[PDB]
Amino acid sequence: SGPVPSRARVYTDVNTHRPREYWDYESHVVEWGNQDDYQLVRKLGRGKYSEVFEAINITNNEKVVVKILKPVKKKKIKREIKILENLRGGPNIITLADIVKDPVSRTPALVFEHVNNTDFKQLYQTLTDYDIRFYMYEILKALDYCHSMGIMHRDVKPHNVMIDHEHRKLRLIDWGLAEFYHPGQEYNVRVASRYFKGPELLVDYQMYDYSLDMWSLGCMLASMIFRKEPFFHGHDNYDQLVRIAKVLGTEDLYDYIDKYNIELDPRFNDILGRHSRKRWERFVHSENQHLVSPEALDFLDKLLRYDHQSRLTAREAMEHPYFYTVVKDQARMG
Numbered sequence: 001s002g003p004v005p006s007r008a009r010v011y012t013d014v015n016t017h018r019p020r021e022y023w024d025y026e027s028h029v030v031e032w033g034n035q036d037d038y039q040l041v042r043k044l045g046r047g048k049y050s051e052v053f054e055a056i057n058i059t060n061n062e063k064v065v066v067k068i069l070k071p072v073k074k075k076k077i078k079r080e081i082k083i084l085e086n087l088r089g090g091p092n093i094i095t096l097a098d099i100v101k102d103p104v105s106r107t108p109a110l111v112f113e114h115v116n117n118t119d120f121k122q123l124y125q126t127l128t129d130y131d132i133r134f135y136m137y138e139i140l141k142a143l144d145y146c147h148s149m150g151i152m153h154r155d156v157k158p159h160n161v162m163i164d165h166e167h168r169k170l171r172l173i174d175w176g177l178a179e180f181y182h183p184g185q186e187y188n189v190r191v192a193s194r195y196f197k198g199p200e201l202l203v204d205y206q207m208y209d210y211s212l213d214m215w216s217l218g219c220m221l222a223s224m225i226f227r228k229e230p231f232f233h234g235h236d237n238y239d240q241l242v243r244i245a246k247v248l249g250t251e252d253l254y255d256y257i258d259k260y261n262i263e264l265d266p267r268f269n270d271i272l273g274r275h276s277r278k279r280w281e282r283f284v285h286s287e288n289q290h291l292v293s294p295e296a297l298d299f300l301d302k303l304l305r306y307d308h309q310s311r312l313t314a315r316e317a318m319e320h321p322y323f324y325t326v327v328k329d330q331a332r333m334g
């Protein structure tokens, strides 16, 4: 038997039409700068794969951000570098400015354009209904671009969205989990953060595509309009699917498994149970109702689907009525 193959609905063959060196990052040669051009000012945050510092470029007194990479496979470093270089200059994509190594420790580090140390997670508590739509639209610009360039981000979450609210600009960061989409390729399902993992990751379906990012975006949107962080609050990867099933229902879940002939881990048998598909009104209350509208719920429903092929693409999402006012305002002034 085996699982049923799958293909992305959009941007399916974009990498095939590219020269090999565009996506064959294992053969990419890295252009190393001089780390003596940069002095670290202060630590910004600590991660599982890197440490982020505010720094200064000695040569031109320019503020930068330096991401010191924790030891990982050489090919993973080349992948993040190649993806950042391919996407450089794209809408709302963080700009990679330089690549350096410590002379003694040989530890690699990436230097980025400076952004204010404010991510989406810290800000959305004070956001109006319009601001949520505005910044969701800006994220969709970055996703539609990188998807059109044949790249899945695979780690979309509020922590990876830096926002300068005073200037109303945002940047999508942390491309260390991003990967090139190739039709027929099977990918590692051990990606993204638990609360944002798509059902394809949780049931171990490896032939996924750009639509993985659209599930993660739906998880972000639900947490913001409902003020429930996270929206799917699982204890682990198994319970994460249970939390989803208690909302989206078990019937569509098993139909999804049947459609792609997915061999489900037997542990799920005794924990998924039977659950109806819940109406989104269940999560509306007096403190979030000003963020919830029929347009928001209709848009959210079309993102959070078990069947990855049934989710809105980034471009389809940008044309939803949820963004009509945002589109009109950008047409007038931008």
Ligand SMILES: Clc1nc2nn[nH]c2cc1Br
Pocket (backbone or CB within 6 Å): 052, 065, 067, 094, 112, 113, 114, 115, 162, 173, 174, 175, 176
């Ligand atoms: Cl602040 C910051 N963090 C990152 N993590 N991965 N890439 C990154 C770029 C910037 Br700028």
